[PDB]
Ligand binder design. Structure first.
Ligand SMILES: Cc1cc2nc3c(=O)[nH]c(=O)nc-3n(C[C@H](O)[C@H](O)[C@H](O)COP(=O)(O)OP(=O)(O)OC[C@H]3O[C@@H](n4cnc5c(N)ncnc54)[C@H](O)[C@@H]3O)c2cc1C
Ligand SMILES: Cc1cc2nc3c(=O)[nH]c(=O)nc-3n(C[C@H](O)[C@H](O)[C@H](O)COP(=O)(O)OP(=O)(O)OC[C@H]3O[C@@H](n4cnc5c(N)ncnc54)[C@H](O)[C@@H]3O)c2cc1C
Ligand SMILES: NC(=O)C1=CN([C@@H]2O[C@H](COP(=O)(O)OP(=O)(O)OC[C@H]3O[C@@H](n4cnc5c(N)ncnc54)[C@H](OP(=O)(O)O)[C@@H]3O)[C@@H](O)[C@H]2O)C=CC1
Ligand SMILES: NC(=O)C1=CN([C@@H]2O[C@H](COP(=O)(O)OP(=O)(O)OC[C@H]3O[C@@H](n4cnc5c(N)ncnc54)[C@H](OP(=O)(O)O)[C@@H]3O)[C@@H](O)[C@H]2O)C=CC1
Ligand SMILES: [Ag+]
Ligand SMILES: [Ag+]
Ligand SMILES: [Ag+]
Ligand SMILES: [Ag+]
Lengths: 487, 485
């Protein structure tokens, strides 16, 4: 009937998941469209999506590298002795090693397309022509040469999101998360704008890889970084980023940026101050990447900042056109898009339909002291629950009395419904938190109670065993108000 | 009525749990008996039990120290340059800092007793006289001076366990886990006898803290270390301990040990070979410490290796006498004894009786690549289950392509009942495994199914998220047989 069963615009986390699934476990003719084959600074994303090329994968590698600064310093207390006087890392050999790993994943995706029959990779910029036609061009410009014209039954949009910039003079002098991955040298005088995921995470990277006398300044528009997270975790993280070197700067926002006679950028703030930074990164946000896809031509509903209007099954305004991942602007994570993609395949090609559960999704923040959250905060649970108990526990891991890093305090805060005992949210700060929160997310998806926690015999010399030691709540929330006692 | 409500013999993990609980949350007159107040060689354990003084606490500190050997080496690939040749750690400043931490906990317990009313610490060797009288002597000898005579309603035994040696000539030339904590110098030529918990853990410590050209030989009586653990996890550890430096030797056992004219020990093996070790540690096992408690005088039953025979509520032969922890020889762990102790309090002084759940208890092995297990192995689940599915997954963390340690392979193995899909066992090998297994243990006590795992949306750049990626089983066991499908 048609040339392909599916054309996937975007070979991302979600995109490739659906592509492979339709082609292998259903034997369908699948075409996957993407910008380029291997990662690279002209057009950053590639085969594997942001996640693989300019996202989670390289980020984690760099965060792991920066984490050594602490560990090399901490080793002293345990009897490990070396030349610690102004010891600095090699940024060039990090990026070198990072690229070799990213490209290796790029390369194994190439041979995947050469070895899987039904799957075909189509390089270029995809755009919609009608309900059944996707046109591949060599540019985002609608007037540039047409490389391919794909005729398909279904169309899936998985083009993800794209960095947001702030509309100020000197905006193009700044870098984003994209450019950060390919910097020639590690900046000495660094400014991270914003208080989001990337802002906090990258602040840690640069602070680990700063040269001599270098400093990283994080500035945030509001008065507490990481809005939406547990207020007590946020405050404790702010304190710990400081103790680690990163100078946090609340209620501050840049307005003017100009370049100097040495390359460095001159930044003008809100309070009127002027400081000189070698690099300035903007972690403002990520808007869904759909501006060039010509959704109007096919009649696909575009809403909140270019987000693609979808229902619970990812179906758009047109019955055969679907969208998954960051482009839908639901929950912008890698494992979410993968689930949304697998659920899409099961729905249309599998027969048995299934919707993606967006609630109670465990995620992490790979800041130097990492965060692990799943579920509701105090503010949210007290907002729409009758009565809620709040459990709290802060402890310094015993090893840190030797290592010297006494600021490193592990924190667990469980938020439960008082009526039932149901765990509505668990919030963690400290090493191993992203690992621990994963299996917590399993429990919350099972709908677990606080009684299920402190009844499990612990595993002693661990941080996670502290989940099972919280019996008495710190305080309560009664019909909205913060109360220290409950009659 | 009489002097004390409770006399606890042993200020251990469980002993101190039962003491504090009865005294604070029930306002009972509680006496706690122990050998000494601060850690120290002559009699190793102190206030806090084995676990605090010569157990989990110091062990973990030393395992964390050793892990820096890998971490310093691994940093190179990420751009961290320094002097790496001949770089060996300072053992003396490790023990120094270890002692400082252990002593502060000792001190913390000392001020606890002085501030908690009802609780009183009584230094000396406790021994039974009758169903209500506990005698405190200055020595383990039953004829040394009597320091105190405590008269109590209830008696709780929490004296824990003690290292086992092997009956061979040269047995007293060896060290145990106890002496290992207070070695004056890090051994160059090390031998670890046995293939149990302590063996694998300490092998990693000494291998981390070995001087120049040093080596650690681990010898085990059988042909695969750590019996009772997942056979595939065991084999993968054996390779990784090897790759990390430790030379594993199976089907081998020492028989004769003699000292030389420089201090070093000469060891005669099972195959007939002889080799020289600066130090030789015996991780043979731990027998319940009840040899000098005179349970006969009070009429308390001692069965297999002197273990105090108890029911599900810790009650012994006599209705007032109880026992918890390693001395019962049920499950020799710190959090087990704490639970046994807390349940003991609830049983008698709390009103509401409660028994300790010994099945499906998550534990860990702090090897250089750590282990995290909970529930049944393949062998055990195939013995007493109709049909069982075996899920397996091995993967190299992405960072290890840069760090150079490509041998460090993370492994997860889930063992489920094929009938309903119930998770009967989870076995892990790699970093964070002891952290991950804890919340796995929450699920298994919760009675979780494999469908609960792979239906949870993961947390991408983690090792624990792979737990939710196992959908199709590697193979099956059908009525006992290893079945392809
Ligand atoms: C720096 C950074 C770090 C992150 N770290 C994490 C993390 O640690 N954990 C986590 O869960 N999430 C993380 N995220 C988010 C995660 O990377 C995304 O949510 C994920 O990539 C979404 O998958 P997707 O398939 O929807 O989009 P993507 O994976 O980004 O796929 C989009 C692909 O579509 C292609 N494309 C774009 N336009 C077109 C077009 N015109 N025609 C054809 N193809 C096109 C692009 O080239 C791109 O390859 C991070 C994000 C960033 C930016
Ligand atoms: C090296 C090592 C590492 C370990 N690591 C871990 C681990 O990481 N995780 C884990 O879960 N378990 C671990 N264990 C096991 C754990 O330490 C014990 O199971 C736990 O301490 C048991 O608690 P208990 O109260 O029954 O005995 P203990 O905590 O050992 O208490 C016994 C106390 O009784 C005292 N005592 C002895 N005889 C008398 C007497 N005659 N009169 C009065 N008092 C007496 C002793 O001085 C001692 O202080 C480890 C054990 C060892 C040896
Ligand atoms: N799971 C993980 O480990 C990671 C996930 N991600 C995903 O990718 C996305 C990356 O977006 P990111 O921007 O880094 O994080 P966010 O979009 O969550 O947060 C952006 C921050 O920038 C601030 N901000 C927004 N607009 C402005 C402005 N105009 N001027 C100054 N400050 C502003 C916001 O302030 P305010 O709070 O006041 O609105 C907020 O603190 C995340 O949303 C997340 O979904 C990214 C990295 C890691
Ligand atoms: N949870 C944790 O992290 C830790 C817990 N522990 C606790 O300490 C307890 C005791 O540890 P451990 O001392 O290592 O005892 P184990 O029972 O754990 O292991 C003893 C090892 O020595 C071997 N062995 C036994 N008898 C002899 C013998 N006569 N000659 C030669 N080899 C022999 C055994 O092999 P085989 O019997 O298979 O032939 C076994 O491999 C453990 O049960 C555990 O509860 C200790 C350290 C860490
Ligand atoms: Ag990713
Ligand atoms: Ag559960
Ligand atoms: Ag302990
Ligand atoms: Ag669970």
């Amino acid at each position: 009937s048609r040339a392909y069963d599916l054309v996937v615009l975007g070979a991302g986390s979600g995109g490739l998941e659906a592509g492979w699934n339709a082609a292998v476990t259903h034997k369908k003719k699948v075409a996957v469209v993407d910008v380029q084959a291997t990662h690279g600074p002209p057009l950053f994303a590639a085969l594997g999506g942001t996640c693989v090329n300019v996202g989670c994968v390289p980020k984690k590698l760099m965060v792991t590298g920066a984490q050594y600064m602490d560990l090399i310093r901490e080793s002293g207390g345990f009897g490990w002795e070396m030349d610690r006087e102004s010891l600095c890392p090699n940024w060039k050999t990090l990026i070198a090693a990072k690229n070799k790993v990213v490209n290796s994943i790029n390369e194994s995706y190439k041979s995947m397309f050469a070895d899987t029959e039904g799957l075909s990779f189509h390089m270029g910029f995809g755009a919609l022509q009608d309900a059944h036609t996707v046109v591949v061009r060599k540019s985002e410009d609608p007037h540039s040469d047409v490389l391919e014209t794909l005729d398909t039954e279904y169309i899936l949009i998985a083009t993800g999101s794209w960095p947001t910039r702030l509309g100020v003079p000197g905006d193009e002098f700044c870098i984003t998360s994209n450019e950060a991955f390919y910097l020639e040298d590690a900046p000495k005088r660094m400014l991270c704008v914003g208080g989001g995921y990337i802002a906090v995470e990258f602040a840690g990277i640069f602070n680990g890889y700063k040269p001599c006398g270098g400093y990283v300044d994080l500035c945030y528009r509001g008065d507490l970084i990481l809005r939406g997270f547990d207020t007590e975790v946020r405050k404790s993280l702010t304190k710990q980023l400081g103790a680690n070197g990163i100078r946090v700067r609340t209620n501050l926002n840049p307005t003017k940026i100009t370049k100097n006679e040495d390359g460095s950028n001159h930044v003008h703030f809100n309070d009127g101050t002027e400081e000189d930074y070698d690099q300035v990164m903007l972690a403002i946000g990520r808007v869904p990447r759909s501006q060039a896809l010509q959704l109007d031509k096919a009649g696909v509903r575009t809403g909140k900042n270019g987000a693609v209007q979808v229902d619970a099954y990812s179906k758009t305004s047109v019955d055969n056109i679907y969208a998954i991942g960051d482009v839908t602007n639901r929950v912008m994570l890698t494992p979410v898009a993968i689930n949304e993609g697998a659920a899409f395949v099961e729905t249309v090609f599998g027969g048995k339909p299934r919707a993606t559960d967006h609630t109670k999704v465990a995620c992490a923040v790979f800041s130097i002291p990492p965060i692990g959250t799943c579920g509701m905060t105090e503010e949210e649970a007290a907002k729409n629950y009758e009565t809620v108990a709040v459990y709290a526990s802060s402890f310094t891991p015993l090893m840190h009395n030797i290592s010297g890093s006494k600021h490193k305090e592990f924190m667990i805060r469980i938020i439960t419904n008082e009526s039932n005992g149901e765990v509505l949210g668990v919030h963690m700060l400290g090493d191993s938190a992203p690992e621990i929160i994963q299996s917590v997310g399993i429990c919350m998806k099972m709908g677990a109670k606080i009684s299920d926690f402190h009844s499990t015999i612990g595993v002693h010399p661990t941080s996670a065993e502290e989940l099972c030691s919280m019996r008495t709540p710190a305080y309560f929330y009664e019909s909205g108000k913060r109360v220290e006692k409950l009659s």
